[PDB]
């Protein structure tokens, strides 16, 4: 039994979503390993399977519910359970292939998709890019519904792919970035929904690159600056870890702590 964190979109407030994300982070990493003030996720290699995942239980005002499984190494969604079925993205190696069989063992039906959970593939299936897919409590509410109905036959592939894209960003990306968590709190605050702006999208795209640069950094300065975009799409470069401390909450482990 992996740890379970419960969140409802019903009556969702800025605080309840903040408490939720805080708790998700708390389960992803012990915080024992920090590098330049930024917590590093457990190193995949050597990690015992009984520690490998956490579970995120999502429910809405519709009183439908689904269970997401997150990999503690990258904080990313690997699959989910609705009712008597579990569904998993295509594992990219044998060792990942084996890991997920420890998820949702008592379900009647077990499916592995032909596709992975990367944005490029999901976008192709959903028929839309991330920048065309709106985010907020309303979109999460619908995504949860689409995911639950998939197990009953009421959800088509394109809507499923779209719902993944919504959940991954509002949960995984938000746990990874305080900045992305912030934009979600803002949507909830004004009770609005909107597609993510360029600052959100480029962060998402850059998480692995920023994990590497921060961990390989000499003294906190980057050998290669990292270009990001602001909300308005204008471009600027990050030369130093100091400016990302407010931005990025967790990193994938790239190397030994020295």
């Amino acid at each position, epitope marked *: 039994q992996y740890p379970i964190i419960n969140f409802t979109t019903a009556g969702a407030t800025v605080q309840s979503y903040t408490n939720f994300i805080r708790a998700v982070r708390g389960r992803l990493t012990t915080g024992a390993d920090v590098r330049h003030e930024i917590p590093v996720l457990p190193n995949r290699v050597g990690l015992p399977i009984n520690q490998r995942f956490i579970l995120v239980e999502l429910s809405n005002h519709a009183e439908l519910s689904v269970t997401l499984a997150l990999d503690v190494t990258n904080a990313y969604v690997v699959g989910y359970r609705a009712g008597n079925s579990a569904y998993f993205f295509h594992p990219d190696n044998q060792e990942d292939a084996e890991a997920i069989t420890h998820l949702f063992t008592d379900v009647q039906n077990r*499916y592995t998709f032909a596709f992975g959970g990367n944005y490029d593939r999901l976008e192709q299936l959903a028929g839309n890019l991330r920048e065309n897919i709106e985010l907020g409590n309303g979109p999460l509410e619908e995504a949860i519904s689409a995911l639950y109905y998939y197990s009953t036959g009421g959800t088509q592939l394109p809507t499923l792919a779209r719902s993944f894209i919504i959940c991954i960003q509002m949960i995984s990306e938000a746990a990874r970035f305080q900045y992305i968590e912030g934009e979600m709190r803002t949507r909830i605050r004004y009770n609005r929904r909107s597609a993510p702006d360029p600052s959100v999208i480029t962060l998402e795209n850059s998480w692995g690159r920023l994990s590497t640069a921060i961990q390989e950094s000499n003294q906190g300065a980057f050998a290669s600056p990292i270009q990001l975009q602001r909300r308005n799409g204008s471009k600027f470069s990050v030369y130093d870890v100091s400016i990302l401390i407010p931005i990025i909450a967790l990193m994938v482990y790239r190397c030994a702590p020295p």
Partner: nanobody
Framework: VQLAETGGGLVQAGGSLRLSCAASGTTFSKNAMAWFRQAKREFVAGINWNAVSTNYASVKGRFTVSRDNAKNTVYLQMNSLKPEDTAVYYC??????????????????????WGQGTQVTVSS
């Protein structure tokens, strides 16, 4: 998706047939495949994307399922054929799932693409 099947027809008993099915355009190496048969439409054999996991129905120890991802082909090798095996055989696939485990393996509904059937008739 396009399918091309070979093998079928009349064979005697204790004798054998090989059914072959080529698929396209899809990503076949990523696709769960299955064989079904009718009279009277049920699951016969099925195989996952990497061919490390296979299921059989009545046919166990006789029929074996195989695939070559290089050719986008899936095979059914039928051995020790008995009159009760006479049926129309359909190759099925899923462009959605790489692996279908549990009950859903045998649901015709788990598979979103289907070849035309081939009559297989095993005489006494």
């Amino acid at each position: 998706v396009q399918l091309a099947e070979t093998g079928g027809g009349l064979v005697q008993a204790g004798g054998s047939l090989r059914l072959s099915c080529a698929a396209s355009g899809t990503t076949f190496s990523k696709n769960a495949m299955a064989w079904f048969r009718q009279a009277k439409r049920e699951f016969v054999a099925g195989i996952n994307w990497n061919a490390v996991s296979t299921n059989y129905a009545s046919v166990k120890g006789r029929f074996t399922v195989s695939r070559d991802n290089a050719k986008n082909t899936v095979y059914l090798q039928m051995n020790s054929l008995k009159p009760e095996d006479t049926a129309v055989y359909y190759c099925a696939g899923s462009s959605i799932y790489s692996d279908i485990s549990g009950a859903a393996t045998v649901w015709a509904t788990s598979y979103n693409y289907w070849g035309q059937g081939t009559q297989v008739t095993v005489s006494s």
